[PDB]
């Protein structure tokens, strides 16, 4: 039944299509990021071909050519990813993924690894929370709340969590963008993505753009003369222009995260773009005990023990480490031959992960 | 004859597969399997040649001699010297030393044979250049009617892994064909300094050249139809490997008093 249906469909379609493409190829021949038409020749004009590639620079410049639909033929009327004039016939720069980042409006996280982050958490409240809550109070005062925030210290161990916790509280869309994706290996492909991210920010406004990595898309380096990182440089400049240029920065907050605090590019650094510089704050003794209770709710353990006890033996540990204690107490628990974890598995589990870590 | 005519592209011969098949590399970066000459066979034909190919009839028209000159990875050739010894005075002792080291094995094979020695492939000159020391070297090149081949030993100092170390082998090969010849090495002590530590790129090359000369000198039985003259101004920045005899036998001093 099915096998016969598929093949007939494929032959039937293919013969019609084969006739139509051959017809459109006559002349000598919608994503296009470079568009040959292989010596369709006439002439004034009648070649009308945009190639954007380093080899072969075709400029159809000096303002208008008025056309109904057309540059020239060859399945590939268009004007690549970067335009040598030629004001946009037929859809060339609509490309399927020019977005791929993860948006979480009104986040799940509100308290996860956010215990003993008190100094960090208070800063976010004053900077983000209160101008969102009352835009009128900041206007009357004369001040601007921070246009940009830069967050450094151990990254995603509680950092991303803390950010999601403040955002949920105000009901503010959290937009999480992965630095590394912004690293596409095609022309502009990169300038495409940045632009639409900031367009989205203005529509959905009252929102946080969280950039994990900013050295993935690059900052300062000596390696621009070292012959490759052209693609990188296009992305970097596009980003700066969009932000400082016409993004309102009262409710829309941009948060930057960095791995080396000393590798910023001078454009990035300067006040009017980055104001607030926030430290990661490590969970404190009281805080670690609470995070210990939160994560063991999934696990199947005795509730008559105290979390506090594990914390005294624990030295200064990021939210990630606390979680690592919790999965390890259960592996210990199976090893010691019981299906509950005692205090004693928690103590062993601390001893193992914290020595192992050696940072 | 009329078809097989200039202008031709130059490409390089890899190997003859069999008779009337050879594999060739065109210098376009396209390689082809082609037929070969029926003027040559396999006894008239060596595997590595520079060759002449037809442009559109892509086949072995003619054979050229090997060639090495190019504007990448440059080598200095100086043909027809014009310097004859005792340019500077007080090199009486030194005029005699060079003469028996460099000049003598090329002109007379026969004296080395009868004593029962094999001719030294290397001489080391220590002293300042351009005092009287260079002048003598150039004078030997003239008298033997030898091509003077000037090598700046830090010139490969190229920053790639690839072209330069390959070239140096080819230079010496080209010298043996056009025997006799002088390979005259400016500051061989530059590239007698090598890695000992992690330095990654941009320090890797001096190892490559040093090793290339070493493989050749120790790896092959002695002959001299081509002489290697090393010229040195820092005498401690050498490596012992060079200085080992049975190959490098002559250590000629330039006098300073």
């Amino acid at each position: 039944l099915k096998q016969t249906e598929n093949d007939l469909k494929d032959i039937e379609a293919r013969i019609k299509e084969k006739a139509g493409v051959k017809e459109s190829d006559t002349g000598l021949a919608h994503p296009l990021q470079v568009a040959r038409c292989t010596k369709i020749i006439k002439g004034e004009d009648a070649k009308y071909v945009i190639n954007l590639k380093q080899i072969a620079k075709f400029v159809v410049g000096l303002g208008e050519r008025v056309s109904p639909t057309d540059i020239e033929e060859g399945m590939r009327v268009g004007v690549d990813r970067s335009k040598y004039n030629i004001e946009l016939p037929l859809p060339p720069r609509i490309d399927p993924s020019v977005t791929m980042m993860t948006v979480e409006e009104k986040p799940d996280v509100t308290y996860s690894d956010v215990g003993g982050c008190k100094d960090q958490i208070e800063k976010l409240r004053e900077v983000v929370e209160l101008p969102l809550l009352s835009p009128e109070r900041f206007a009357t005062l004369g001040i601007d709340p921070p246009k940009g925030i830069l967050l450094y210290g151990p990254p995603g161990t509680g950092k991303t969590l803390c950010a999601r916790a403040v955002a949920n509280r105000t009901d503010a869309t959290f937009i999480r963008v992965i630095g590394s994706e912004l690293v596409q290996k095609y022309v502009g492909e990169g300038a495409r993505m940045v632009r639409e991210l900031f367009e989205m920010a203005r529509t959905k406004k009252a929102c946080i753009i969280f950039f994990d990595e900013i050295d993935a898309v690059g900052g300062a380096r000596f390696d621009d003369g070292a012959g490759g990182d052209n693609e990188v440089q296009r992305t970097m400049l596009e980003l700066i222009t969009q932000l400082d240029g016409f993004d309102p920065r009262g409710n829309i907050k941009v948060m930057f995260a960095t791995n080396r605090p000393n590798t910023l590019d001078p454009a990035l650094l300067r006040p009017g773009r980055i104001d607030r510089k926030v430290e990661f704050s490590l969970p404190d003794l009281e805080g670690r005990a609470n995070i210990f209770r939160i994560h063991s709710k999934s696990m199947s353990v005795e509730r008559g023990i105290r979390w506090e006890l594990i914390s005294r033996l624990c030295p200064n540990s990021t939210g990630a480490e606390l979680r690592s204690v919790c999965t390890e107490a259960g592996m210990f628990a199976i090893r010691a031959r019981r299906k509950v974890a005692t205090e004693k598995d928690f103590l062993k589990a601390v001893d193992k992960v914290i020595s192992g870590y050696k940072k | 004859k009329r078809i097989q005519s200039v202008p031709l592209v130059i490409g390089q011969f890899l190997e003859p597969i069999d008779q009337n098949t050879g594999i060739v590399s065109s210098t376009t970066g396209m390689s082809y399997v082609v037929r070969i000459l029926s003027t040559l066979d396999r006894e008239l034909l060596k595997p590595s040649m520079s060759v002449a190919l037809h442009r559109h009839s892509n086949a072995l028209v003619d054979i050229l001699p090997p060639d090495s000159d190019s504007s990448i990875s440059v080598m200095g050739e100086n043909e027809k010297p014009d310097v004859t010894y005792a340019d500077v005075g007080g090199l009486d002792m030194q005029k005699q030393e060079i003469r028996e080291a460099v000049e003598l094995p090329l002109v007379q094979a026969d004296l080395y044979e009868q004593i029962g020695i094999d001719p030294p492939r290397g001489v080391l000159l220590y002293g300042p250049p351009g005092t009287g020391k260079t002048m003598l070297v150039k004078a030997v090149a003239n008298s033997t009617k030898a091509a003077f081949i000037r090598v700046n030993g830090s010139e490969f100092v190229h920053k790639y892994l690839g072209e330069g170390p390959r070239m140096v082998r080819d230079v010496f090969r080209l010298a043996r064909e056009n025997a006799p010849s002088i390979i005259f090495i400016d500051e061989v002590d530059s590239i007698a300094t090598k890695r000992f530590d992690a330095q990654t790129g941009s320090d890797r090359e001096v190892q490559r050249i040093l090793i290339e000369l070493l493989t050749q000198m120790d790896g092959f039985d002695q002959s001299t139809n081509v002489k290697v003259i090393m010229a040195t101004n820092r005498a401690d920045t050498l490596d012992p490997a060079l200085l080992r005899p049975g190959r490098l036998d002559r250590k000629i001093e330039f006098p300073s008093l």
Binding site: L28, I41, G43, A46 | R2, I3, H56, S57
Partner: protein, 247 residues
């Protein structure tokens, strides 16, 4: 299918000369002659049309130019029809462009039938001349020399493509040919001059032939070569002999 398209000497000469200077920008012109029955296309003359600096096109044909040359031709007494067109097109000689097919289709409806002559000037310096002649569509030998009638049955049902590679021949007239051969004062000067200059130079040539012999003879000894020695003895001998003969 099969047609002997007969190219006049003058047409040929003027096409190779023009086409070699004209490239890399395409050049075209019109072929003059007659159809005689079928099996035969005679091309009598050819004249150039203008160049265009990015290549000639169907958009560049100009009927006033072609017209003004013919009318002026007529009063010599040159009265021919158009039988086709020539184009340079590098890298065409067994293939056609989709532009060039379409171009041929317009041209052959004006004429009775028509050839697209495409000359390639790159392999015209390699000790060969490349030229081909095409005509897809028409009746003239696609029905006299052409499964069975396979090209024109499929042709008419459409959604097909075949080039229409034709046959070609040459000849103009005997008198032109005797004249061309009389291009080669003349033969006498040439022969004396060579004679004197041979006697001067025989001094180097003597010695050089002694080496050739000597090399050959040495080779043979090791081996036992004989073939090289024979070739090499004949060449030297024939060439003495002419040097002696002149005097």
């Amino acid at each position: 299918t099969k047609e002997t398209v007969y190219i006049s000497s003058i047409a040929l000469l003027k096409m190779l000369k023009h086409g070699r200077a004209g490239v890399p920008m395409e050049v075209m012109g019109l072929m003059l002659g007659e159809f005689v029955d079928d099996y035969t296309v005679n091309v009598v003359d050819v004249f150039a049309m203008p160049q265009s600096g990015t290549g000639v096109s169907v958009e560049a044909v100009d009927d006033v130019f072609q017209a003004k040359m013919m009318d002026m031709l007529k009063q010599t007494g040159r009265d021919q029809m158009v039988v086709g067109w020539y184009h340079s097109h590098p890298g065409f000689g067994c293939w056609l462009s989709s532009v060039d097919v379409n171009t041929q289709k317009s041209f052959e409806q004006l004429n009775s039938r028509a050839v697209a002559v495409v000359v390639d000037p790159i392999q015209s310096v390699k000790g060969k001349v490349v030229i081909d002649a095409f005509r897809l569509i028409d009746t003239g030998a696609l029905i006299n020399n052409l499964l069975n009638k396979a090209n024109i049955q499929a042709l008419i049902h459409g959604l097909n493509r075949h080039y229409y590679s034709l046959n070609i021949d040459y000849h103009k007239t005997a008198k032109e040919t005797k004249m061309l051969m009389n291009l080669h004062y003349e033969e006498k000067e040439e022969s004396n001059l060579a004679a004197t200059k041979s006697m001067v130079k025989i001094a180097e040539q003597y010695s050089k032939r002694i080496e050739e012999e000597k090399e050959l003879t040495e080779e043979e000894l090791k081996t036992r070569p004989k073939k090289h020695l024979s070739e090499t003895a004949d060449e030297t001998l024939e060439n003495n002999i002419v040097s002696v003969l002149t005097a």
